[PDB]
Amino acid sequence: ISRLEELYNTRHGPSNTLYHLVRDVKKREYPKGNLPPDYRISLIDIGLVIEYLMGGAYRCNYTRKRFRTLYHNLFEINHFPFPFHELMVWAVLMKRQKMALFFWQHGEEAMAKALVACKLCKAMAHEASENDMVDDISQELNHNSRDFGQLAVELLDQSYKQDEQLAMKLLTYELKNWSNATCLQLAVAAKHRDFIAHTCSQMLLTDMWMGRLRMRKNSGLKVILGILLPPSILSLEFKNKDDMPYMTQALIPLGRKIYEFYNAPIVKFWFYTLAYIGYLMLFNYIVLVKMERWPSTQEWIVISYIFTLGIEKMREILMSEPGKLLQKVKVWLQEYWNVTDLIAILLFSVGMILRLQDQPFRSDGRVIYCVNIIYWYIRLLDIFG
C-alpha cells in the first residue's frame, strides 16, 4: 500500500491531469478548494477519482469500509492479491500508455481491464476538455481510449474463435474487483459500440432475450399463441434448470413452466405490445365515434392506461442510478422518448380535464385528444425498433 502511494505521489515522468482530478473531487466532497502544494494523495483520494470517472453506481475497492479500516490501522495484509489491476489503474491515470499496455498483458481480467481503461480514458478526455486544458491532452486521451477499446474487441474475437460458450461466461461473470460489475455492462458504460455489435455479444443478448426457453424457431408466433392461449404454454420445449442462469440476486412442474414463461423478456415485450395495440385501437374508437357528457367504457380503459403509464414512468424515475431527485429527473430526460412521453401524458391530463367540463371545453378536450393520437402512432415506431 505504501509503495503504491509513493507511485501515485511521484513528480517524475510525463505530465498528467491527475492533480486536477484530485482537486475537483476534494472540492465536491468538502465544498478547501485548491489543494496545498504538499498534499500527499491518499488511495482514498484515488478511489474517489475513480468514482467520478466511472460514473453510475460504481464502488471502487479503495472507498469500501474494508480498505478504509486497514488504511487507518496502518497509516500479507498490506499486499494486493491482484497487483496488476492496481498497476493498470495507476498507469491509466497519469497517462502512461506504453506502461499500461504492458500491464494489460501480465496479470488477468484483461477483458475487464481493457473496458475499464476505455471508460477511464474517455472520461478524463471529457474532463480535460471541460476544464479548458490543452487540447492535445484531450486528443491523446481519446486515442488511448480507442486503443483499449480495440484491444477488447480483438480479445473478444479470439475468445469467440476458441470456444463460443466460454466466451459468454467471460462476458457475464461477476467482476468482484470491479464493483461486482459485468464485462457486458462495462462495455455499455464505456459506450463501446463495436463491442456490443460483435456477434458474440449479440447471441449473448439473444439468449438473454428468450429467458428460460429453448424455442428459437419461427420467432414471435409461438409466444403470441402462448399469451392468447395459456394451455399453449405447456406444449413448448423449455430450457434446463442450470443451462445458463442469468439471475439478479441469488402440478409443480406446470406452475414452474408458467412462471418461467411469463418472466421471459420476449414474452413481456409481446404482452406489452399487444396491450399497446389494444389501447391504441380503443383510442381510435373514442375519437372517431361521438362522445357523451360522461366517458364511455372504452374511454375509461384509455384513461386508465394513461394513468398506469404515468405511474410507471414515475417509478422509472425513482428506481434509477443517482441519489438526488434532481439528478434522477435529469438522467431520465436524456432519452428523447421519455421527454415526449411526459409531454403527451400532460396533454392527455389537460385534455381529459377540459373534456370532463361542459361546452365549449368539451370540444377543446377532443382536439387535444386528436393531437395526442398523432403522437401514439409515432410512438408505435418504438415497437418497430
Partner: protein
Amino acid sequence: VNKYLGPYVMMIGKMMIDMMYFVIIMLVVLMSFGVARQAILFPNEEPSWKLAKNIFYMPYWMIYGEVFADQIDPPCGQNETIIQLPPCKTGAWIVPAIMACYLLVANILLVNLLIAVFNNTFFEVKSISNQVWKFQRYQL
C-alpha cells in the same frame, strides 16, 4: 425467358421487401393523419364502417399528386353571396397544419428514402438476379 426482362422481373421481386417496409412506415403516418383529420372534422358521428374508409380514403391519394384542394381549408363561419356557410368545428385550423406536416413527411422524406434504398441496393440485387436467372435457365 428473355435475357433482359427476366433479371428485371426478379429484381422487382427483390425490391418488394424494401417496398413493404416503406408501406409499413407509410401506413403508420397515413393512419395518424387520417384519424386526426376525420376525428377533428366530424365530431358527431355514429359507429359506422365509413369512418374506417375515411381514415384511408383521402390521405392515400395525397401521395399521388391529388391534395383535394377544395377541402384543404374550406371557407366556413361567415356569410358569402346570400348563404350561411356552416359554423366552424373547433380545431379545424389544425387540419391544414397536420396536412402540411404529413405531406412533407410522405412526399419528401419517405419516397426519397425509398429511392435511396432502391439505389444503394441495386448492384447486389442486379448481380444476384443475373446469376439466379442464368441458374433457372436449366429449369425452364
